[PDB]
Amino acid sequence: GDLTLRDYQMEVAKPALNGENIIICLPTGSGKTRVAVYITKDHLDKKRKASEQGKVIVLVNKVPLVEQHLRKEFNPFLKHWYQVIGLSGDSELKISFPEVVKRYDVIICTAQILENSLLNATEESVRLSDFSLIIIDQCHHTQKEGVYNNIMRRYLKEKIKNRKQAKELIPQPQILGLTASPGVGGARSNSKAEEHILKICANLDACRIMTVKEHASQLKNQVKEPFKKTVIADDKRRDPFRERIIEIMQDIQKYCQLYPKSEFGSQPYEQWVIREERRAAKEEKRKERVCAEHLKKYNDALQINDTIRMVDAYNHLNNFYKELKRRKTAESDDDSKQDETDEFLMRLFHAKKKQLKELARKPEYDNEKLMKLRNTLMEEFTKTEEPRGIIFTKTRQSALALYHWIMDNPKFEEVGIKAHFLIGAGHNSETKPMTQNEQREVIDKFRGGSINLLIATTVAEEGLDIKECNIVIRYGLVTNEIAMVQARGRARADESTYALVASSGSGAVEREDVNIFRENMMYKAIRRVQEMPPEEYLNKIQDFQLQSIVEKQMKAKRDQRKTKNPSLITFLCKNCHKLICSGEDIQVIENMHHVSVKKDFQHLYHKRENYQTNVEIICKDCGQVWGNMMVYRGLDLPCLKIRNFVVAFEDTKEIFKKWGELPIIFPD
RNA sequence: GGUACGUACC
RNA sequence: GGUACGUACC
Ligand SMILES: Nc1ncnc2c1ncn2[C@@H]1O[C@H](COP(=O)(O)OP(=O)(O)O)[C@@H](O)[C@H]1O
Ligand SMILES: [Mg+2]
Ligand SMILES: [Zn+2]
């Protein structure tokens, strides 16, 4: 069942029920989406009784939230009274969006489905005037160049144009923002915190920002905060894995004569060594670029030794050199690759390989954070009958490696822990992705009980419905104040704890403290804009709105300048600098995957196993990855990744990470 | 592929 | 603005 609100929910709803644009700030577990449904039904029922056209769009930022808001909230209470539909880019609908607007009263979709129609591109459109109410889920993203903010910039442009036609009357939707924390925008001062709150208010055209105050006690009974802990590890353990890896890196640096201005295993080392790899490739210095590539792989092993067990560090290097054997070795079905440097670096590893493998088997040198994590898990999974937990970590590799650490250790299995990792769907990582369906099944098994502990990246912090946790561990991960409150929001079972496990040397404890500081500033700043007199608030809101419109015009003029011709360019291999393609030889498939056409192109490469296929293309002369094969219309075609080539010009040699960075448009 | 946001380091 | 890690949308 029956559509009602709690008193704290009604308190924040009241102005939206009277037709005012507002932002609603309700904590995690407060039922913000239930408030959205009550306001949707109320809004539509009033439009019926006034014989008027009622229409609502609910905008979300993740695809699963479309289906989730339908099932749990929107269909149960509205389906029998109004036409309701959930829509996404993933679902190939046979109806166009403009028709979906004509047929349905409540549209729940991802924001880019609306923007695609407002833009058109391919050209009677949809406009924001078609909708009488627009609800934005997770409205703290209504910021900068986000899709939310682009939708709302059209709304403000239509608001200003409306006053021009009064003096010489196009209808404007009501707007409702829903969030748990609008944020502080990286501010370190209360002034800049209050500036950020007003900017978000300005972007959503809010009459007022809305929080629970009269029924604050009721809200505190509904959602109980977890107990906070900070488990620090000083790491005064001797670290012979770090020491011997550094000796290998030092040896390599003397060979190539590349010397850093920065500590081993640190972030500026990683920047330097990647810069040095790029430079050496441009300048045809195979010795330097190959060494810098390996040095990076050793620099990875140091920083994963810092966060996870040193066996995973071993495996990172061990797998790299396994793949190096495969590419450099002349196999059958092929129509020397091994340089001096290649031979030097391979033997260096094999020599010092024995020690590292067997040093890695001794857990006494195996990372103090892991014991602190172990101890925290043991004491918490023995605390309750049917517990559930999440470990938040920085890298995908770290998520998978922690899963193996939990599995390759029978005392966690003994005490009832049944772990599984959880990572992103994107394909920009050097680790492989989980698909959206695999993500869904893991989260479903977590609610079932089949799975007990998630080792998650930031995938698990916002939006998605996850079962109430007894423990949330931030394992070395400290991002922003919004993510912090969202992570703390997952721990909402009876007797739940939120814990930061980190090295004192990482500076993550100090960054957690500024995010606590920022969170406190946020509440003071919300309080200040609520107490601000209307005339003062209105003027500041108008300023931010006007200068936000100007902000898009500037970025429009930036992107206009860079707006080629092929055959200007050749393609050299980054490792060995052999001539391979001209610019005329390249053609594109569905304007995304680039392919070579040259008639005698097969002679310049070999095929190896390890998106279309799982067959790599590698350089004949040197074994450098160029990309992979693909099947298109029954033709075996070579897909070349731009990362792998030095691109020469006629007038200059440069390396690009994306095909779009080249100032050249290619054929179909 | 394209784009966006978050964080760290320059 | 750059590099990397992470996430997402089309
Ligand atoms: N006024 C209400 N009456 C009954 N149940 C409610 C009410 N508000 C919320 N709920 C229930 O609580 C749940 C909301 O939890 P959740 O989705 O975690 O909230 P939020 O999205 O704010 O974090 C829903 O399953 C809903 O059925
Ligand atoms: Mg909800
Ligand atoms: Zn080559």
Author numbering: 297 to 419, 422 to 466, 470 to 636, 642 to 869, 872 to 918, 928 to 968, 972 to 988
What does the paper say about this structure?
For co-crystallization, we used 5′p palindromic duplex RNAs, the ATP analog AMPPNP, and a construct denoted chMDA5ΔCARD-Q, comprising the helicase and CTD (residues 298–994) with the mutation E436Q and lacking seven residues at the C terminus. The structure of a 1:1 complex of chMDA5ΔCARD-Q with ADP:Mg2+ and 10 bp dsRNA (chMDA5-10) and a 2:1 complex with 24 bp dsRNA (chMDA5-24) were solved by molecular replacement at 2.60 and 2.75 Å, respectively, as well as a 2:1 complex with 27 bp dsRNA at 7.2 Å resolution. In all chMDA5-dsRNA structures, the helicase is in the semi-closed conformation, but unlike the semi-closed forms of RIG-I and LGP2, Hel2 is well ordered. This arrangement is more similar to that in chLGP2 than RIG-I, with helix α3 being kinked toward the nucleotide binding cleft in the same way, allowing Glu369, stabilized by Arg330, to hydrogen-bond to the 3′ OH of ADP (corresponding to Glu67 and Arg32 in chLGP2; compare Figures 1D and 4D). In the chMDA5 10-mer structure, there are two 1:1 complexes in the asymmetric unit, which are arranged exactly as in the 24-mer structure except that the dsRNA is not continuous, lacking one base pair between the molecules. The bend in the dsRNA axis in the 1:1 and 2:1 chMDA5 structures allows two MDA5 molecules to pack closely together in head-to-head fashion, with a center-of-mass to center-of-mass distance of 43.1 Å and total buried protein-protein surface of 1,961 and 1,907 Å2, respectively.
Homologous double-stranded RNA (dsRNA) dependent ATPases RIG-I, MDA5, and LGP2 (RIG-I-like helicases [RLHs]) are key cytosolic pattern recognition receptors in the vertebrate innate immune response against RNA viruses. To gain further insight into the role of LGP2 in the anti-viral response and its co-operative role in MDA5 signaling, we performed structural, biochemical, and cell-based studies on chicken (ch) LGP2 and MDA5.
